């Protein structure tokens, strides 16, 4: 195998042979790839139209190189709540707020996260601002999960060999297939999740990767462009269960949610988004809460997939009570306290 | 303009706006583009399918940055004989031998040329092996042209600012839109040429660039994959004249040429290819001679373009006579002697 062989095949608009995508990604992760080669591969893989098999090979190499958590430290029903980012809408941190609520409802959460790429404050940035430690290693994340009910895996910390690739990506700016890999490479390997995809035409491929792993996942894309379940309009959901994918459209109005305007979900810097978290967890009613409760419920539905309508109802009930009882506010405080010890 | 904008447009499989290819190439030539960006552009432009407008902009930037020849030193009817290479056959240097014959027939030839990419020898390398000085500045190429009847512009010598692009070309290996630019960027700007193209789907694009310039050119592709008029099988000729492009098929056997086997046109190292030049110019008959006579005749038809079958007949006569009189052998000896001075 070689770069001229693989790049040539891609520029011929042909799918790769089995193992070729993995070879390429392994060359990239081990530092044996030139930036020009990394870039050529990223762009070519994107314009050919990647397959689930191919993207799965990429994610697989990353996970084969990632720092794992210790054995028997991640509950079999742990869930992730994370998105690709890149929706260019710059919102409050919906996945992170949902994650907290979900944990507070008693679903174990091992969250994969990262700083912002284009937004003002990403999940990792806002958690930082809240006083939550984002620098924890495998053992401490494992302890966080057991002691608090939530663990945060900071992507750069668990995927050190990915730096070469990430660098090239910033240099070229355009989204590529690599923009899918974040959600697909949680190092704790949870089997369930609510997974945001900003790219409507690649979400199905992402779902395909999760199906192959037999995860219970909702891959979500808001029809307004959000890599979240949105409240401003309908969302597209690729529901992954029993190794199968099926495309659905979801309308929150069916569950009594009023439509919101995108500006109502708008975020700011880390201090502002941190304030927004506290407000929701503090019981503030409004569009931000509604969006949080919806995405939380979605994660719980994914967890249950390990009955659609009853599952959503139960999820909305549980997510709302987790906030109203103070359990979610208390969990964030305990999470902060955990790191300070 | 910006890289995320331009690259985003290409990955969305859209043609660029007027001026965007030029901005990109200008960033590349002025050392303002990172290797990753260069590569991403080359690959993205290739897989979108470049237009004649876009490739003409690339070539135009290169020519706007090139060392020119002194004013009033390039005959208005000068011709080029050159191809893309990248045919992966390692043949004898047909364009270079053809170029000598054409000059010997009294048609001024300013040849754009370069060392080999994958071939064992290459045009510029074979000339060196023959004692010809390839690394001459603008002033001396002009003198060579006036005194000998032929001039060689060494692409690296006249296009220094292309160095960044050439490096990335090497690293990624795969042919890209950049592989079209050599024949399109002769710094002497001849208005006629026999132009070889190894990429059948891109030959029409090259033809359109010459058409926009109102050049008189035959863009040629051997149906055996040769970036020359072949003697193995038929050939596809995009004829360019009066700003219009007419595609047509060409069979050498219609002029008495026996079909040869590509083994017979095979090449070797510089010393080997240099020997083959001396052999053809010395009167040796066989498949190599025939191919040289055919391509030389093609260049002469292109020159005439500044009647199809009659032009080819006169072209074939003039080519054969230029060898048979010894004029081509003599012109090479004088070309060598010119360099030793
Ligand atoms: O800058 P962007 O490209 O727009 O990405 C915004 C954030 O969204 C993603 O994470 P995540 O879903 O976990 O964070 P969230 O809570 O804000 O939704 C990503 O890792 C970023 O942190
Ligand atoms: O290494 P390759 O990619 O296979 O290309 C072989 C040669 O052909 C091209 O020029 P040119 O047509 O002028 O040289 P020629 O005499 O061999 O035809 C190219 O510049 C190379 O020198
Ligand atoms: C230096 S960024 C990085 C570092 C290590 C691993 C990964 C996977 C990423 N990238 C992401 C991680 C997540 C969790 C979300 C998005 C991305 C991305 O860059 O698209
Ligand atoms: C470092 S190679 C180079 C250097 C300067 C200018 C050019 C245009 C090229 N490239 C070519 C020039 C010719 C004449 C033929 C082919 C190529 C090519 O790169 O494929
Ligand atoms: Mg998110
Ligand atoms: Mg988001
Ligand atoms: Mg040639
Ligand atoms: Mg050739």
UniProtKB/Swiss-Prot annotation, chains A, B:
The residues the record assigns to binding Mg(2+) 2 are 227-228
What is this enzyme's catalytic activity, as reactions? N-(5-phospho-beta-D-ribosyl)anthranilate + diphosphate = 5-phospho-alpha-D-ribose 1-diphosphate + anthranilate
Q: Which enzyme class, named as a word?
A: transferase
State the UniProt keywords alphabetically: Amino-acid biosynthesis, Aromatic amino acid biosynthesis, Glycosyltransferase, Magnesium, Metal-binding, Transferase, Tryptophan biosynthesis
Q: Where does Mg(2+) 1 bind?
A: 95, 228
Any idea which positions bind anthranilate 1?
83, 114
The note on the cofactor says: Binds 2 magnesium ions per monomer.
* Record-level GO BP terms: L-tryptophan biosynthetic process
User: What GO terms fall under cellular component here?
Assistant: cytosol
* Pathway membership: Amino-acid biosynthesis; L-tryptophan biosynthesis; L-tryptophan from chorismate: step 2/5
In this chain, 5-phospho-alpha-D-ribose 1-diphosphate is annotated as bound at 83, 86-87, 91, 93-96, 111-119, 123
Q: Which GO terms describe its molecular function?
A: anthranilate phosphoribosyltransferase activity; magnesium ion binding
Residues binding anthranilate 2, per UniProt = 169
Give cofactor(s), names only. Mg(2+)
Quote the EC number. 2.4.2.18
Which Pfam families does the annotation name? Glycos_trans_3N (PF02885), Glycos_transf_3 (PF00591)
* Similarity section: Belongs to the anthranilate phosphoribosyltransferase family.
State the protein's purpose: Catalyzes the transfer of the phosphoribosyl group of 5-phosphorylribose-1-pyrophosphate (PRPP) to anthranilate to yield N-(5'-phosphoribosyl)-anthranilate (PRA).
Kindly give the PANTHER family that the UniProt entry links to this protein: ANTHRANILATE PHOSPHORIBOSYLTRANSFERASE (PTHR43285:SF2)
Query: What name goes with this protein?
Result: Anthranilate phosphoribosyltransferase
Species: Mycobacterium tuberculosis (strain ATCC 25177 / H37Ra)
Protein's gene = trpD
């Amino acid at each position: 195998p070689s770069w001229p062989q693989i790049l040539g095949r891609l520029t011929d608009n042909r799918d790769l042979a089995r193992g070729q995508a993995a070879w390429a990604m392994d060359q990239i992760m081990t530092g044996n790839a030139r930036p020009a080669q990394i870039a050529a591969f990223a762009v070519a893989m994107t314009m050919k139209a990647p397959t689930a098999d191919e993207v799965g090979e990429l994610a697989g190499v990353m996970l084969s190189h990632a720092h794992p958590l210790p054995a028997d430290t991640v509950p079999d029903d742990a869930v992730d709540v994370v998105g690709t980012g890149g929706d260019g809408v710059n919102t409050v941190n919906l996945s992170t707020m949902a994650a907290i609520v979900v944990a507070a409802a008693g679903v174990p959460v091992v969250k994969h996260g990262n700083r912002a790429a284009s937004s003002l404050s990403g999940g990792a940035d806002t958690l930082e601002a809240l006083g939550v430690r984002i620098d924890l290693g495998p053992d401490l994340v494992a302890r966080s999960l057991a002691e608090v009910g939530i663990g945060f895996c900071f992507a750069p910390r668990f995927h050190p060999s990915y730096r070469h690739a990430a660098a090239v990506r910033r240099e070229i700016g355009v989204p590529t297939v690599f923009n899918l890999l974040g959600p697909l490479t949680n190092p704790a390997r949870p089997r369930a999740g609510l997974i945001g995809c900003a790219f409507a035409d690649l979400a199905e491929v992402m779902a395909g990767v999760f199906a192959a792993r037999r995860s219970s996942v909702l891959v979500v894309h808001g029809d307004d462009g959000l890599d979240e379940l949105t409240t401003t309009t309908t969302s597209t959901i690729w529901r992954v269960a029993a190794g199968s994918v099926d495309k659905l459209t979801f309308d929150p109005a069916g569950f009594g949610f009023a439509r919101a305007q995108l500006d109502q979900l708008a975020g700011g810097d880390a201090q502002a988004n941190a304030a927004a978290v506290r407000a929701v967890l503090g019981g503030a009613r409004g569009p931000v809460r509604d969006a949080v409760v919806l995405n939380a419920a979605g994660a719980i539905v994914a967890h249950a997939g390990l009955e659609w309508l009853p599952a959503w109802e139960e999820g909305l009930r549980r997510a709302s009570a987790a906030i109203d009882t103070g359990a979610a506010e208390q969990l964030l405080a305990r999470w902060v306290r955990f790191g300070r010890q």
